[model samples]
Target chain A: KTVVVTTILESPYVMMKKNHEMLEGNERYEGYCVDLAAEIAKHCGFKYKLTIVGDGKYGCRDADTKIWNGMVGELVYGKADIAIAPLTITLVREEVIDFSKPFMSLGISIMIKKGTPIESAEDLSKQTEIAYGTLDCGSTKEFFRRSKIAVFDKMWTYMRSAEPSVFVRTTAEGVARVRKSKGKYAYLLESTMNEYIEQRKPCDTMKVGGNLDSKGYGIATPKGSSLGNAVNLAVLKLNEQGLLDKLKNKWWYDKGEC
Target chain B: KTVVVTTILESPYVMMKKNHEMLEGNERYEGYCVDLAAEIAKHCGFKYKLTIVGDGKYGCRDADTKIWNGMVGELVYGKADIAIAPLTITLVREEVIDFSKPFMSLGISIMIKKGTPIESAEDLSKQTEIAYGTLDCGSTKEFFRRSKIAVFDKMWTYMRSAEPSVFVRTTAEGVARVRKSKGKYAYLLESTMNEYIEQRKPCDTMKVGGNLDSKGYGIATPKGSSLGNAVNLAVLKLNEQGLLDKLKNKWWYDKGEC
Candidate 1:
């Protein structure tokens, strides 16, 4: 049987090739996750079709409707068999789905334009000179909304009431604002993507301070999906063989440009 | 019984107080580690005496004699019962001693004078315009000597044979060299010290790039010392109760000058 793998088009994870127009199906895209999915399928003894989620989101529940959206929705509604992307394993998500052991670990990080005087989350919390925000409708947003840590809660309060709305719709938009804000704004996102962007051209942005919190990304399957056990073991096997580290280096550093 | 704790005199971790001449016993010194030692003793129910290592070195095996020197030597020779300081827990050292779960986490980081053109390790490794080195007889130096990663190993090769012997005898000396070198030198050291120094008066240096490697500092003991279990439990209790983090802020930020 062909497994349907639902993922998002995130840079360095999944993206169309420069020559994608000349290709078809799975051949049309390539990235860290694309390679990862191929390995998982090979080891699990299955053929798979890769599909981008209809809504371009990591996934979240509507505060009012309580409906899941994005790749998470795709899995929850049985529209897809699995999610093989940078989907964070959060408490709320865990209640509705089973996430394989984290294939990759990451944490929330601060991204600042070069020469910004801001150093830590505490500095940002105490200052008005630099505005900061998270991507709207994602785990990062929910993280702040329900955070109990004083520093994080303070930041969340500031963000929740800021007049102009500090939230962005996408990671790219958040990064663009950082680049154009002339050190007047800081963007918060996963450390992996922040580090990836830091190595790209212009190189005017940097991840400052240590990670604000620790978490990871997992291969998520619908609750009670038969594939959960096999996927988790496959990830553990890849991790033990050093393939995960090798793949990360292959995509993030070896192919990096600045 | 009083435990004999062997520690090194490193700024902010352990150092002579300004009024050292008028003080007696543990009262002669003050720093993050000094405060930490006090807390650990109280929690573990022990009386302790602090003694500085006979040699200033952090610890390393002599290539010729194979003898451990510095704090590690003190522990190996039964000169001290425990070591509570910013002593790194490395693989080599772990084989000869036991370390409690790290009370503080840190990594090798790059310290550059403000306005230095370099931003990442890749940037430093590829350029001849700026000189960088680690402390001559510490974990940072040993990290490069034994590294298997290509980027770090390459950096190690460059530093091992760099003309004028880039290695400095102490972190303070390294910071001074970076300041006076006028953007021509970068120093590699632990992130905790780099961040600590960045907040001190002058504030002429900044930590650049992600850490080259991840490691931590543990309260160390002889391989089979009886005090090991108590010290480990005390550290975990402090960590769980958030006392460890509070102590870090007490020394690193609340007392910061810059």
Candidate 2:
């Protein structure tokens, strides 16, 4: 039986090959997660078909509707057997799906331009001169929304009301603002993306302050799915063999311009 | 029914108060886990009896008997309703018992005398002069045994067949071995304990090298315990409030002799 994998299109994770129009099947994609999906399937002794989620979301339940969309929905709705993407492991999502032990650690980190005057979240919140925002639909945004910490709550209040809309539709959008804003906007994104961006040319961007929080990205399966245990162990095995770190170097640093 | 919480007597996490012999019931115990047990119980709205684990091991399966022992067994064998100690969240233990999200992060770290000339796992593994080993019954030990990485696999081979029995019965024993051995024998234990020891008086020992691996200590319940959900959420609430970090500061650093 072939496993149906649902993923998202994200830079350095799942991306279109330059020659994709000439390619077919899984060959249509390339990047970190494309490699990881193959490794997970090979270790578990199964074949897989990789399909991108139709909605382009990481997955969250719409509070009023209680409907989940994105890669998580594919598993929830039983359209896919697994998700090997840059999907975050969060408290709410785990209630609906099983995540492998984190294959990669992702943190709520601050990305700033070369001379952004802030060094910490407190500093970011204390000033209006520099504005900041998070990706529209991920856990980092939720963290600020739900945070009870005084500093974080203040940040949430500011970002929630910022005119010209502080929230970015995507990471690259947030990153673009940080690069193009001339040190006027800081992007709150996953540290992995922050680091990946730091390594590429236009190295003006840098990750600063401690990670505001810690979380990870795991291969997700439908809750109570029989495949959960085997795939979870495969992640642990891959991590122990240092495949995650090796692949990280392959995608993030080895291919970087800076 | 009173929630039965099984914990181990590890310093800073759990310990006897000076007036313990004159105390009764839960009053006799003190330290981080004791404080946390109360908080978990309070948050979950359950009355609990905190009992120390009989065997004092951090639950691992005895291969020959296929039987588990330690705080983990209390949950598995139904002797206790919950484990609110420094019990690790490992793939094996997680199969039989459910862990709340990590209450604290733990890692496989090297503990050495102050001037011991070592800095990384590779440095420790490549030399025979500074022999090392892990805790008697926990995932750190299991990590090396099951590791497929060449450096880790070779270290496991060296540890498994070494003469003079490299493993220690408890963290205290391993810590003492590190102190008394001066520089000859380095002890491999959890990074939490390593950091705890580093802050105390007689601080001649230090944690060296990057963590060999990363994991965490979590509250645990039986595989499908009815109370698991609330307790898990309670832990998350505490973590979000920075209570875990606060408690660590209280028990480990605030009360530390150094």
Candidate 3:
């Protein structure tokens, strides 16, 4: 059976058509993640299809709805054979699913509108003039909430109480907050996502501050899946050719910023 | 003959009185570097003195004065037996001196005044509005110059010509630049030095972005010095105990930020 890999439509990773009528196969998805999935499939000798998760949200267990919607959730429920989107590997997610060796390493970074007076994570705790939040229930938010690091713990408190509920549902929504907030609101997201958005038109947001923690994105499979080893080897091969970093730059830095 | 080992007062590596009149022998410098030197000296069966380099600069060839300074210079000039400072092994320096197997790996990083609107090295090329620079004429600068990577190449062009001359004569001078520049200027220097500054009291600056390249610090001896092999083995011993990362963290992040 062909493997069904779940993903999302975030630019430079996955970009959906304005009218759902314009794409086919891998062509339906274009960006680093799509290219990475194709390469991994080729290297592992697996036939695969790219399918976006039905819900627009990043994967999370909804306390009220009891439904999982992101590619992460698709893997958890075995709705897909793998998740090839830019999903970060976190301790919490590791408890529910198996992840291959990291295909890409990244960290949680703060994306602030240009001209904002913040430079580091430590600055987030000391000042309140600008409000910031992370993608709700995603890796960045979870990291901030669970961090043993002192500055992050304090910043989490401020973020939890910021007015207008700054937590965004998607990276698109988060980027919009940064662009429309006039520097008053900022979004904390993955370094890769922030870097990718920084390349797009208008290019008004800047990733300010060092990453709060170090982690990587792996080709995630459901627990007990047999595909993990082959996927891991495939990633190592790409790394050897310098293709991984190349793909990252191709999507996150080479294209996008105006 | 007692070996004269030259070092500096960078915390968690070497920390001495602000004035040299106050200490002597091993007491003059105490931290990871000091500890590593002692272990290596013991393994190599050599008697050594931990003396601070008088010039307090990482040794580099002086085109004008025709004299060497820092631990590197001391070894070259026949003043010291070996250098245990966090000295990097680079091709240029290797041509003039001998370096033991690397004890710890490091690379160049950007340390900005808290809240500088930058994330990756690639960000430097897109905007000339923000002035940036690096420690002038060091391995860090060389990495940027030698990089064929698109981001570093772009950064090299801007750094090679910035106002007030982005090139700083010393690492400490670069630290001072970040501390005082408010976020207008970012200083590029060694990851070890960047982390060291982060551990000091009132840690005002931070190492930002991922390291640009990977290399290691070596115990430097004048060409064909007798201690190379034993010193390398001693470093391997420290590696087994996980003391290397501990020593690094102790200097860069353990104490309150400087």
Candidate 4:
């Protein structure tokens, strides 16, 4: 049986190839997570099929309903055997699923169009003229929502009730808002995303300040999956050979439009 | 049964009281670990006795004899119930013993007289006029022994068979040699150890460069011990309230002579 791998179609992680219509199976897609999944399966001695998650979400349990959504839901509902994506290895996520040691490290970061008036989270928090927020359903937002530090809590309070909603459904929407809002909107995201976009076309985006917090993205599997141990060992083994860094370089920086 | 806690007199973490001979049991000692142990045991609901490890050495398994030494040995052979000391956490140690999440963070660092020629491990590796070594049976020595990095490997090769044996029986011996030898000896120990000694009576020594490697010191229990989970939570709980930082301040910097 082919192992069903759940993932999202976020750019540079998973994206339809330009000629995807003419291709079949995994060939229809390409990106860092696509390449990463193949290497993981090959090393783990299993056959896997990529299935784009029904909801393009990293995952969070619904507080009101106690139900999981996104790729995490796919695994919890037994629709997927593993999840290979830029899923943040967060504490809440780890409570319901098992994750390999981080294959990629990242942190909450401030992403703004280059030359934007914003310089730091503190700067954005103090001024309401330039509105700011994060991808509404992901780790960046989760951080703002749960953070108790005075500055971060203050920012969360503003975003939680800001008129017209500063939140965006996707990172692309958030990044687009920053690029198109003409300094009226700044985006908060992971440093990995900020750095990658900073180098892409419209190289006008820049990440400012050190990352707000440190965390990592990990390859995830069902809580008690047999593949957990081998997948973890594979991640560690690839890291030892610098293969993870190699993949990251190829996907995130090699084709930079900047 | 009383929980028999094993520890070493490693200064600030553990020390005999000035009138230890007149005192009995726990009152015979006092320091950071002694306080920390009381906190852990009370939170964990256990009565404990602090017994100084007979051999002052931090544990290292003998490569030739396969025998373990120091506090690690105490827990391994069931001579003690737990280890509460400034024990450096490492992969090899974790394999045979259990450790809670770090109560204190530290790293391998180079300690030298303030104006020494050395600035980095590379500088020390390339020159030989000033000699350096680590605690003979501990993580610092093990790092140099197992490190594959070119500069570290070169240094390790030289130290392994260097004339007069650069390694010391204890950290005190190493620091004593660094201070008393004028400028001929440098010491490689944890940053916590280096910073502590730098403020002692003789303030001529200083730690240089960023630490060689990042690691931490954790409370230890035996493998598969029942206290593992609660002990881990205890460390995290203390850290949340800045209790660990408070203890660090009280011991490491608050009483500084320099």
Candidate 5:
């Protein structure tokens, strides 16, 4: 049986194949997450199908209709047997789904246009000129909301009530706003994604401040799924063998686009 | 105000002062856990008293009387602001009490009479010439009970059904059994305690087997207590600074007395 695995198009983890139109099977996708998913499947004796999340958001519930969306929804609604995307394991999500051992560690980073006045996460609290916000309503945003540290606590106060125009739909949209708006807007995203983008062409943005907070990226499964055990153990084995690190270098540094 | 802190008199982690009878204020008891407690108090800006748990078991509920006992009870019943002991965070304890970040990582290991035929955790499953059991019916035992691997599952069957004669009341009693039984019996205990005991004089027993599971000894507090935040952060800070590891080596390896 082929397990449908849900993921998002987050470079350099997942990219619409520059030649995806001619690809088939596993060849249709390739990158860090793709390599990891393939290795995990091999270890666990399972086959999987990669499907992009339609909404392109990481995970959220619609406020009006109260339905889960994105990678989280795929598992919640039984559309996918696993999620190998760069989905974060949050306390709130833990109540609804199970996550395998973290396959990677990351933290929130602030991406600002290169010449922006912001120099650190703490500096966000001292200014009102640069409009600061996170990818609207996801784990990254909520992480700042729940933190009690002085800088994050102040940033949360401003962000929770920020104007709607200041919020962004995706990390790319936020990065675009940073580039086009001069130094007027900044985006908060995971260090992995922010750093990957900063190295690419135009490279107009720089990741500022130490990571806002640390967390792990996990392969998510629905609650009570038997696959959770095998998957968790596979991640642990990969961690011990340095296979995960190899995959990171392959996709991130070697330009193996997925 | 003195923050009531519950502790156990585990050697290396906590020891009776040589001049305890003549000591008062901060000089009554001393060792690793005491140092941790003092550090927590310093960072959290609170004063504390180290009260040895009346029942010396780390924490357990009474099977016959259905009453919570030891440090677990102290926190569950709101009798202590925190428990600065070599308290292993078990699933059952987590249901009723909150644990700060772990101060130390440990796993189940075996202490056997020197020259025992059993050389590894796997060896326990192959024969019945030697009898073995855990110190208590708690987390360490549960970890084996819940395992599904071939060797561990077999060991679990042997342990859960073993006669009371094979079970020891405390880790100390278990270590004593290993020392006196002359390879006929083995004591299963946390690696931390096993290593600490291994270094003491009259060391007729030695730890066998790499740890089979991962867990931590944590500072515990009542659920929803304000002290949880400060104590948890202090543990992280100590871990980052290598202070926790230093304390363990100072008391367990350097001093080498129970």
Candidate 6:
């Protein structure tokens, strides 16, 4: 059966080539997830088409409508067979969709411009001098909102009511906010993206402290999809053979410009 | 051949059973590493004897005497077939012996009293309000002495000539000093021990900053020993099977007091 794999256009994970106009189909894009999808398809013995999510989001459920959005929506509505992207596995998402074993492990991390006074989520939560927030409408933001951990709940309270709104719409927007905030604003996001941006040119931002919580990105399929088992085992096989590590190096470091 | 395993008497890694007088051989002791050794032996197909290191140190090379001490010494001098404790894998030791893939990953972390002002290494590095030092004659002290990182180098300089000797001879001594210093002193040690202590009753000390460096603990064997390959592969297998993580939970959290 042909599989329709949905992903987002995140740098290093999924990106259009400089010569994209000359390329076609899967050739139009390349990245860590792109290569990972290819390997998963090969190992799982399936033909697949790579499609970017129309809304360009990692996925979150709308609070008022209780409707899933982004790549998650596509999978739930049957527009895509699977999501092969840096989609975080969260409790809320797991209710509607099944996630394969995490193919990539990362945690929510703090990103600060060089010389920020904040060192940890506790520091950020306790202080009012430096402002911080997670990407709006992302799993990270939802994490703080729902976390029962004392430090995290405190942070959620602060961010939920902070003056001037700390949320940014995109990872790029968050990175730019940190780079330009004069150490006043910190961005919380996935550690993988934070580290990727840290190595980029004009390396003024650094990931501070360890990740606030531990989680991973999984291949998501609609609830009870038959493809889930095959995809999960394929990820395990790839992980055991060290191909995932090699692919991470291929996209994140080998192509690194900094 | 009966494998001779060298370990140290650290609280959670290796410890005498409550009724030690009633037990014998491997049954005489129990802890994280004891269980780990058993699993390794089971997977690698070997009978093993666990012997505590003569010196209680974690092994450091004496510059003047040029003799290794602790579990590392036991492995290097052929007194033990394997060192399967929380022996940190450091570069100097790697030069003399072989370390299997890290069975446990940890970093040098700060242990501060409940109300200390320190939140990050930089905070401690820049101020004198609270004095901090690592255990003397351990990998942590060596790390500071040999580190070229600016923050660590600065810390090393401060520690070298601080008014009072900041070094403690044992982890227990360090914990006691922190407990009694009334927030005037911070102890630096591996995060595992720090977290373990934080869970104990009277949990007034907490691990305050992110770790200063990233490293791991590995099972060690003499250089070029045939056992190294088997042990390394066995560690990977256990990690894959989730036995290592299970063993950690069995020892750390299941038995937690606080």
For all predicted structures, in order, the TM-scores are 0.58, 0.83, 0.54, 0.66, 0.54, 0.55
- Going through the candidates in order, their DockQ values are 0.04, 0.28, 0.03, 0.13, 0.04, 0.03
Whichever of 2 and 4 has more TM-score, that candidate is: 2
lDDT tens readout by residue for model 1, B1-258: 888999988878898999899999999999889999998899788999999998876677889999999999999888999999888766567668777656777668999999999998989888777999988876678767876677877898999999999999877799999999999999998899999988988989999898765556888999879887678767756654557777788888899887
Task: Give the clashing residue pairs of candidate 2, or none.
Answer: none
- Model 1, A1-258: lDDT tens digits are 999999999989999999999999999989999999999999888899999999888788898999999999999988999999999866567667777656776778999999999889999998766899999876688778876679888999999988688899988999999999999899999999999998899999999998776556889999778887678767756754457777888888998886
lDDT of each: 0.85, 0.86, 0.74, 0.83, 0.78, 0.83
Each prediction's total of clashing residue pairs, residues at least 3 apart in sequence or on different chains, is: 0, 0, 17, 0, 1, 0
* lDDT (Cα, tens digit) per residue for candidate 3, span A1-258: 799988877766787655546766767557788889889898888999888888854576677987666877888877899888777655456657766545666667889889988898888788888888887875567667765567878998888888779798877788898899888887887787787777777878788877665556767888778886567557655754557767877776666557
Better candidate number, 1 or 6, judged by TM-score: 1
Q: Give the lDDT of residue A188 in candidate 4.
A: 91
Kindly list the per-residue Cα lDDT of model 3 for residues B1-258, writing each as its tens digit: 898888876666787645646866676566788878877787678888887789777777778997766787888888888889777665556657766545666666878777788876777678887677887775577667866677778889888877768888876787887788778888887777777676665767777788765456778888667775456556655543445645665655565454
Which candidate number has the best lDDT? 2
Candidate 1 vs candidate 2: the DockQ winner is 2
- Backbone-clash count (model 4): 0
What residue pairs are clashing in model 5? A30-A258
Clashing pairs in 4: none
Q: Estimate candidate 6's alpha-carbon lDDT, on a 0 to 1 scale.
A: 0.83
Tens-digit lDDT track of model 4 for A43-127: 9999989999998777889999999999889989898999999987655666688776567766678888887887888998898
Runs of candidate 4 exceeding 4 Å displacement: A1-60, A68-258, B17-29, B42-47, B126-130, B136-142, B145-147, B157-165, B181-184, B240-242
Q: Write the per-residue lDDT of candidate 2 for residues A1-258, one digit (tens) a residue.
A: 888899999889999999999999899999999999999988888988999999898898899999999999999999999999988766678778877767787678999998888889999999988999998876678789987779999999999999988999977889999999989999998899999899988688898988787766888998788888788778767766668877887999889878
Please state the error at residue A64 of candidate 2 in Å. 4.0
lDDT of 5 by residue, B140-207 (tens): 66667666567878988888787756777777788888888778898888888888778887777788
Model 1: colliding residue pairs: none
